[PDB]
Amino acid sequence: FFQSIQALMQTCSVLDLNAFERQNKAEGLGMVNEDGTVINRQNGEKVM
Amino acid sequence: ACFRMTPLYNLPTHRACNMFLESYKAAWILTEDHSFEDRMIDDLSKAG
Amino acid sequence: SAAETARRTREFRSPPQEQINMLLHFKDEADEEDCPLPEDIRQDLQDFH
Amino acid sequence: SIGNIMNNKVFYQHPNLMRALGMHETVMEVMVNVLGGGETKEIRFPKMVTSCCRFLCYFCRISRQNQRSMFDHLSYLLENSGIGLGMQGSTPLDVAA
Amino acid sequence: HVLDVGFLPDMRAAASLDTATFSTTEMALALNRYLCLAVLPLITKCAPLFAGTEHRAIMVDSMLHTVYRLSRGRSLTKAQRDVIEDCLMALCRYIRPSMLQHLLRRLVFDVPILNEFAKMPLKLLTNHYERCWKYYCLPTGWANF
Amino acid sequence: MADQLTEEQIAEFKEAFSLFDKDGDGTITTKALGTVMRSLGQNPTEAELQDMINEVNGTIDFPAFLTMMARKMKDTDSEEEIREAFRVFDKDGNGYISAAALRHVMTNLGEKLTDEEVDEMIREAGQVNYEAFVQMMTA
Amino acid sequence: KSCHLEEEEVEVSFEEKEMEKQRLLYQQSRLHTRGAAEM
């Protein structure tokens, strides 16, 4: 059990900065040519 | 592109239905049934 | 009234899926209603739902 | 079977069906079973990876959402792609690109 | 750089006549002539451009002989903008056209140099009259026009 | 992509291709594709059909035909969509548009574009026709 | 959710606040005696 807790928390993420830039230009676009706009909208899965 | 998007009244009937169902995920996802939560552990488990 | 043209924007702009969201939001919503429909087709949902 | 799939006039008009039936999911395991082997000597049953990988590429060039749905398996695809090299027509690396 | 790139361009219409099997040379005219048609930097003290000027015209000789309606525009726009950079000394290039440009005045190859000729007169309506045979060639073309 | 074509013209192309199917397998040669392609109205020269086999052996199938037809219609569709989409922007449709009118109508196209972006967009340029807008946005 | 249901406002009196921490203590009391917790 303590193997799991020790290993698991080492895979936790931190505030990365490179991934932030990938949002900062991806958010520049507002809608696809014609497909329901950006379906993911927030798409928060990146920084944390 | 956004300036050339099509009006709603020219869509085929079959296609104009699939968009309704997918978009009408705005009456289940927000409504709450509650119900099975407190009546569950009451009739089940206890008084079993 | 000029500005009425600004109000009527979903009707020619936005993709078709966006129009459905605006016209369907108030139907099965509660209390507040924006850009509503005639109060004749908004009764079967409150019966069907 | 796959050759008759790409002529039915319906796998061009309603892509939303084919992600709901998800045949791209099922056909994917077909490739992994035949290619599963210790080394390059396990290239049993060739001429079918090429005959099927061609179908995947055209699926990826029908809609943007079709591109996303299969993109998520990129890490899975490259894991078993850079081993069986030497044939023509297609290879899993091509559909990865 | 033109003393090495034009060496390959020297074999322009060296096969554009009989049959020309491997037309991969036309594929090299999609990343070379396009690069040359992006530099208005031109001076003097040389006449090697004259050999290159006709070479582009020699490549545009084929009105349909392996050109592609889309790939032909690259070579057409390669010279149409190459005129507004020369030192107004385009000598033999005018004589290359002369009346041959006036000839076939009912073909699709007419608009190849028709609009190009108008660009010369619309940039010399107060000069470029310091010649002799060319001045005679202008009237020779004007009367035959 | 192959998503710029509606279903009815895809059906028409499928019918045209199937009407002259070789043996039901959809394998046709170079001479006959020109005939089938000139059968339904479009009659271009021989250069484009020379380059079509170059992009993709004597073995032509329906998917390749559909892709090449799709991307030879899509360029025309894209080149033409820049003129019809502007029709709503001007009342008469000719091209003349007052600069004051766009201050309250050009902020509500559904792109969630507020006043600042259109400030910078129109400031970087009376009545302006459609071609100046083409140069303005296409860049 | 069967436990934490009870888990700009007047001050809470002494007598009432034990009811919440007793109800919470009982709501999960049935859920640790009955095996559970050691899973």
UniProtKB/Swiss-Prot annotation, chain A:
Stretches of the chain forming a coiled coil according to its record: none
Family statement: Belongs to the ryanodine receptor (TC 1.A.3.1) family. RYR1 subfamily.
Signal peptide span: none
Complex and partners: Homotetramer. Can also form heterotetramers with RYR2. Identified in a complex composed of RYR1, PDE4D, PKA, FKBP1A and protein phosphatase 1 (PP1). Repeated very high-level exercise decreases interaction with PDE4D and protein phosphatase 1 (PP1). Interacts with CALM; CALM with bound calcium inhibits the RYR1 channel activity. Interacts with S100A1. Interacts with FKBP1A; this stabilizes the closed conformation of the channel. Interacts with CACNA1S; interaction with CACNA1S is important for activation of the RYR1 channel. Interacts with CACNB1.
Designated name of the protein: Ryanodine receptor 1
Comment field (misc): Binding of [3H]ryanodine indicates that the heterozygous channel is activated by Ca(2+) concentrations 4-fold lower than normal. Single-cell analysis of cotransfected cells shows a significantly increased resting cytoplasmic Ca(2+) level and a significantly reduced luminal Ca(2+) level.
PTM section of the record: The N-terminus is blocked.
Protein localization: Sarcoplasmic reticulum membrane
Organism: Oryctolagus cuniculus
Swiss-Prot record, chain D:
Tissues where this protein is expressed: Detected in skeletal muscle (at protein level). Fast- or slow-twitch skeletal muscle.
Annotated localization: Sarcoplasmic reticulum membrane
Residues of the signal peptide: none
Disulphides: none
Modification after translation, per record: The N-terminus is blocked.
Protein role: Cytosolic calcium-activated calcium channel that mediates the release of Ca(2+) from the sarcoplasmic reticulum into the cytosol and thereby plays a key role in triggering muscle contraction following depolarization of T-tubules. Repeated very high-level exercise increases the open probability of the channel and leads to Ca(2+) leaking into the cytoplasm. Can also mediate the release of Ca(2+) from intracellular stores in neurons, and may thereby promote prolonged Ca(2+) signaling in the brain. Required for normal embryonic development of muscle fibers and skeletal muscle.
Similarity annotation: Belongs to the ryanodine receptor (TC 1.A.3.1) family. RYR1 subfamily.
Domain notes: The calcium release channel activity resides in the C-terminal region while the remaining part of the protein constitutes the 'foot' structure spanning the junctional gap between the sarcoplasmic reticulum (SR) and the T-tubule. Pore opening is mediated via the cytoplasmic calcium-binding domains that mediate a small rotation of the channel-forming transmembrane regions that then leads to channel opening.
The protein's name in its UniProt record: Ryanodine receptor 1
Residues represented out of the complete protein: 2181 to 2277 of 5037
Swiss-Prot record, chain F:
Gene3D superfamilies, per the entry: EF-hand
N6,N6,N6-trimethyllysine found at: K112
Record-listed cross-link Glycyl lysine isopeptide (Lys-Gly) (interchain with G-Cter in SUMO2), residues: K22
Annotated Gene Ontology cellular component terms: calcium channel complex; calyx of Held; catalytic complex; centrosome; cytoplasm; cytosol; extracellular region; myelin sheath
Domain EF-hand: 8-43, 44-75, 77-112, 113-139
Modified sites of kind Phosphotyrosine: Y96, Y130
Other comment: This protein has four functional calcium-binding sites.
Task performed by this protein: Calmodulin acts as part of a calcium signal transduction pathway by mediating the control of a large number of enzymes, ion channels, aquaporins and other proteins through calcium-binding. Calcium-binding is required for the activation of calmodulin. Among the enzymes to be stimulated by the calmodulin-calcium complex are a number of protein kinases, such as myosin light-chain kinases and calmodulin-dependent protein kinase type II (CaMK2), and phosphatases. (Microbial infection) Required for Legionella pneumophila SidJ glutamylase activity.
Protein family: Belongs to the calmodulin family.
Disease link: Ventricular tachycardia, catecholaminergic polymorphic, 4: An arrhythmogenic disorder characterized by stress-induced, bidirectional ventricular tachycardia that may degenerate into cardiac arrest and cause sudden death. Patients present with recurrent syncope, seizures, or sudden death after physical activity or emotional stress. CPVT4 inheritance is autosomal dominant.
Protein name as annotated: Calmodulin-1
Organism: Homo sapiens
From Swiss-Prot, chain G:
Domain of life: Eukaryota
Coiled-coil stretches noted in the UniProt entry, renumbered to this chain: none
Post-translational modification remark: The N-terminus is blocked.
Tissue expression per record: Detected in skeletal muscle (at protein level). Fast- or slow-twitch skeletal muscle.
Compartment list: Sarcoplasmic reticulum membrane
Similarity annotation: Belongs to the ryanodine receptor (TC 1.A.3.1) family. RYR1 subfamily.
Function: Cytosolic calcium-activated calcium channel that mediates the release of Ca(2+) from the sarcoplasmic reticulum into the cytosol and thereby plays a key role in triggering muscle contraction following depolarization of T-tubules. Repeated very high-level exercise increases the open probability of the channel and leads to Ca(2+) leaking into the cytoplasm. Can also mediate the release of Ca(2+) from intracellular stores in neurons, and may thereby promote prolonged Ca(2+) signaling in the brain. Required for normal embryonic development of muscle fibers and skeletal muscle.
Note on domains (UniProt): The calcium release channel activity resides in the C-terminal region while the remaining part of the protein constitutes the 'foot' structure spanning the junctional gap between the sarcoplasmic reticulum (SR) and the T-tubule. Pore opening is mediated via the cytoplasmic calcium-binding domains that mediate a small rotation of the channel-forming transmembrane regions that then leads to channel opening.
Protein name: Ryanodine receptor 1
Gene field: RYR1
